[PDB]
Amino acid sequence: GSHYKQLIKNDENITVNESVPRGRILDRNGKVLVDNASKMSITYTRNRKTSQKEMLNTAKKLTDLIKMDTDKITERDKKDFWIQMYPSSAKKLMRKEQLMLEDGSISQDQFDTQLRDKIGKKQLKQLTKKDLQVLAIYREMNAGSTLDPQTIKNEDVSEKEYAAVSQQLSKLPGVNTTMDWDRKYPYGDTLRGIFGDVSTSTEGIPKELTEQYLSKGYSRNDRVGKSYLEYQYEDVLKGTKKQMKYTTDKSGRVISSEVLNPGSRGHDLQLTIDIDLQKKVESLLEKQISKLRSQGAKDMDNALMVVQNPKNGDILAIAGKQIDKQGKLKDYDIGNFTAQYTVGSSVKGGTLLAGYQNKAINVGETMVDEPLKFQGGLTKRSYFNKNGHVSIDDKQALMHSSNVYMFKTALKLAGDPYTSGMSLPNNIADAGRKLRKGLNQVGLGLKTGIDLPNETPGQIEPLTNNPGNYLDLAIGQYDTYTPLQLSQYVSTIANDGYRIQPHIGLSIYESTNKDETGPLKRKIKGNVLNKVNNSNDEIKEVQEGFKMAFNEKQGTGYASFRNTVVPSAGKTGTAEVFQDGEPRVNSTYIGYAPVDDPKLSFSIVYTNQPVPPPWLNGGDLGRDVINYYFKD
């Protein structure tokens, strides 16, 4: 499978480079996710004046060494072929016409057309099974001449056939055999969008990526990582090419051979993914989509989940689906970090941390949740309390998913505490920057740092004199976020305030031998990006409100998470959106388990569900993943 790629001249002095096999990709338990697999091809090269009877002779020899698919053979192909495969039938068919041809009263053109008009009946069935074999090869030998090689067979080329033909090339003029490698995916479709692609050799480095690869010393012939993991880890996964140096003279006779580099296969790359958890998450996700649809959510068009270990940033599973109006799924795993959404009230843990650290509120502070009234009659209120007046804690605000507690926190942060009928503060630029700065510290609004390309930080619009948008930022209805940000954020809460870089790469192996990992070269770490600027009592208050959300009867997540096999904690969000002018919501869930020493965290995003008066319980997906992961 080793193509050349380079032949570098100098002092009558040639240097040739031979390609090497690409590293494998393994899950966290060593299971092979991305392998190499050999592909063989039989090719033909058509010369200046290589006759038709010669191509028929080479092809007949090939039928002894290979077996062919007899599709592709058009009826034109068979009719022509039939002419040689018995001339004195064709001659018996055109007694009269051959005499006119010789008289010069018809042309060869007219004669040919009329002959191929003259059979299809019982005497085209004269083609024996081996005839169709020779013709299946003949038809590919004529495809468009000049020394451009046409392929005779690509799929299903066996090793018996490759060998029999390779050792016969001196008797098979124009014929050739090639050995090439392609990526093999033992687990099928799972995670193919995250793995990415390598260029198809006929491609070489794609134009979009050219120059960037040439600036590293590669060639336009080289096969390279095109996207996502293959691209991200391209230079650990690529081998070191075998490089020979030759010194010739006069006419070219080599007098000294040099082995600059023997060559080595690429390093194996081990991921944080647990492929069995990944398959289980994917299966629960499809069951949850289908269950949500049968409950009315037939416009829901995305469903995404990230699963991490919050202590080290490891991405244990990452899955997404796009859903059409009939509930057919398309794989959309990369949407967890390339797509951004309005996530709603699940951000409110971050809002409180931002309030504490600017001393806008104190841990444990109570405020009255009630409809707020502003100048001119504009109102704002909490969903759970549209008409009443309730005194609540910061952690009860999280349990209930209070809007008004966060509005009041935002107004205190803007140096303008709520009073009934007030006009909203005119300039909130400095408050907005402080609120975004607080949210940024848990992962809401910056790139999380995932070791994959094309991560977005979400949509971040100006905060100057739009106090309405500013209050909306405090409840999750302004800036947009990715599911991976939600997961980084809940992980920060779960691990006592350390914001960690998510990573799907876990380690790199110094791989030398075929199908053997080798010794460990390098660990891929989730670096601590920052600790939140908050005291331990502030972090624990948010933890406690998250636990009450999942475990108290009034918590928005009680119905889904109160009976998880280990105690779980988290936060829900429901945000109003619109599709073709119809009211919808996004539903979002973050959480972690066990409460006491969390080893699992997740986020879930569904888009364009119906607006609840009927509350769907899409968090059951998180319940189910928790119950599976802590089964034993």
Ligand X SMILES: *[B@@]1([O])O[C]([C]C([O])=O)[C][C][C]1[N]C(=O)[C]C1=[C][C]=[C]S1
Cβ-based neighbour number of residue 357 at 10 Å: 18
Instruction: Give a three-class secondary structure readout of 220-287.
Output: CCCCCECCHHHHHCHHHHCCECEEEEEECCCCCCCCEEEEEECCECCCEEEECCCHHHHHHHHHHHHH
Closest by CA to 607, choosing from 585, 591, 622, is: 585
Please identify, among the stretches 166-174, 205-213, 360-368, 568-576, the one whose residues bind ligand X according to the rule CB under 6 A. 568-576
Choose between 44 and 481: whose C-beta lies nearer to ligand X. 481
Choose between 292 and 500: whose C-beta lies nearer to ligand X. 292
Q: Does 585 bind ligand X (CB under 6 A)?
A: yes
Please identify, among the stretches 204-212, 247-255, 443-451, 567-575, the one whose residues bind ligand X according to the rule CB under 6 A. 567-575
Enumerate residues 317-356 that contact ligand X by CB under 6 A. Answer: 344-345
Q: How far is the CB of 490 from ligand X (least distance, A)?
A: 14
Matching residue, tokens 């033992």? 186
Q: How far is the CB of 342 from ligand X (least distance, A)?
A: 9
Catalytic residue among 345, 382, 401, 587: 345
Please identify, among the stretches 329-337, 434-442, 491-499, 574-582, the one whose residues bind ligand X according to the rule CB under 6 A. 574-582
Tell me which of 272, 409, 560, 572 binds ligand X, using CB under 6 A. Answer: 572
Q: How far apart are CA 569 and CA 550, in angstroms?
A: 5
Which burial class, exposed, middle or buried, applies to 8 when counting CB atoms under 10 A from its CB (0-12, 13-18, 19+)?
exposed
* 345 given a catalytic annotation: yes
Choose between 175 and 575: whose C-beta lies nearer to ligand X. 575
Answer for the pair 23, 266: CB distance below 8 angstroms, yes or no.
yes
Enumerate residues 346-405 that contact ligand X by CB under 6 A. Answer: 383, 401, 403
Choose between 127 and 300: whose C-beta lies nearer to ligand X. 300
Q: Does 468 bind ligand X (CB under 6 A)?
A: no
Q: How far is the CB of 513 from ligand X (least distance, A)?
A: 53
Answer for the pair 472, 344: CB distance below 8 angstroms, yes or no.
no
Matching residue, tokens 């046409």? 150
Enumerate residues 539-558 that contact ligand X by CB under 6 A. Answer: 556
Choose between 4 and 383: whose C-beta lies nearer to ligand X. 383
> Mind giving me the DSSP string for 107-171?
-HHHHHHHHHTS--STTTTT--HHHHHHHHHHHHHSSS-SSPEEEEE-TT--HHHHHHHHTTGGG
Choose between 161 and 369: whose C-beta lies nearer to ligand X. 369
Q: How far apart are CA 163 and CA 178, in angstroms?
A: 11
Please identify, among the stretches 2-10, 388-396, 428-436, 571-579, the one whose residues bind ligand X according to the rule CB under 6 A. 571-579
Please identify, among the stretches 72-80, 231-239, 422-430, 572-580, the one whose residues bind ligand X according to the rule CB under 6 A. 572-580
Choose between 502 and 610: whose C-beta lies nearer to ligand X. 610
Q: How far apart are CA 312 and CA 309, in angstroms?
A: 6
Which residues is 240 bridged to in the sheet?
Answer: 264
Enumerate residues 606-625 that contact ligand X by CB under 6 A. Answer: 611-612
Q: How distant, in Å, are the alpha carbons of 433, 492, 514, 534, 561 from that of 414?
A: 10, 26, 63, 19, 35
Q: Are strands 329-331 and 315-323 parallel, antiparallel or unpaired?
A: antiparallel
Choose between 332 and 478: whose C-beta lies nearer to ligand X. 478
Binding track over 126-165 against ligand X, x by CB under 6 A: ----------------------------------------
Q: How far is the CB of 353 from ligand X (least distance, A)?
A: 17
Answer for the pair 146, 45: CB distance below 8 angstroms, yes or no.
no
Half-sphere exposure of 530 (CA within 13 A, CB side): 15
Tell me which of 573, 610, 618, 622 binds ligand X, using CB under 6 A. Answer: 573
- How many residues line the site for ligand X (CB under 6 A)? 16
Closest by CA to 134, choosing from 74, 54, 45, 62, is: 62
Q: How far apart are CA 58 and CA 44, in angstroms?
A: 10
Cβ-based neighbour number of residue 95 at 10 Å: 8
Choose between 241 and 571: whose C-beta lies nearer to ligand X. 571
Please identify, among the stretches 11-19, 433-441, 482-490, 573-581, the one whose residues bind ligand X according to the rule CB under 6 A. 573-581
Closest by CA to 174, choosing from 201, 151, 153, is: 151
Choose between 337 and 478: whose C-beta lies nearer to ligand X. 478
Q: How far is the CB of 556 from ligand X (least distance, A)?
A: 4
Q: Does 574 bind ligand X (CB under 6 A)?
A: yes
Tell me which of 263, 349, 476, 526 binds ligand X, using CB under 6 A. Answer: 476
Q: Does 575 bind ligand X (CB under 6 A)?
A: yes
Q: How far is the CB of 312 from ligand X (least distance, A)?
A: 28
Please identify, among the stretches 12-20, 129-137, 357-365, 569-577, the one whose residues bind ligand X according to the rule CB under 6 A. 569-577
Which burial class, exposed, middle or buried, applies to 144 when counting CB atoms under 10 A from its CB (0-12, 13-18, 19+)?
exposed
Q: How far apart are CA 315 and CA 307, in angstroms?
A: 6
Which residues is 177 bridged to in the sheet?
Answer: 42
Q: How far apart are CA 466 and CA 463, in angstroms?
A: 6
- CA dihedral of residues 48, 54, 59, 60 (deg, nearest 10): 180
Q: Does 582 bind ligand X (CB under 6 A)?
A: no
Choose between 349 and 502: whose C-beta lies nearer to ligand X. 349
Residues 340, 344, 346: CA angle, nearest 5 degrees: 100
Closest by CA to 490, choosing from 573, 605, 569, 410, is: 569
Residues written for the chain? 632
Q: How far apart are CA 157 and CA 206, in angstroms?
A: 28
Q: Are strands 390-392 and 367-369 parallel, antiparallel or unpaired?
A: antiparallel
Choose between 191 and 575: whose C-beta lies nearer to ligand X. 575
Report the interface residues with ligand X, using CB under 6 A: 344-345, 383, 401, 403, 475-476, 556, 572-576, 585, 611-612
Q: Which sequence positions are flagged as catalytic?
A: 345
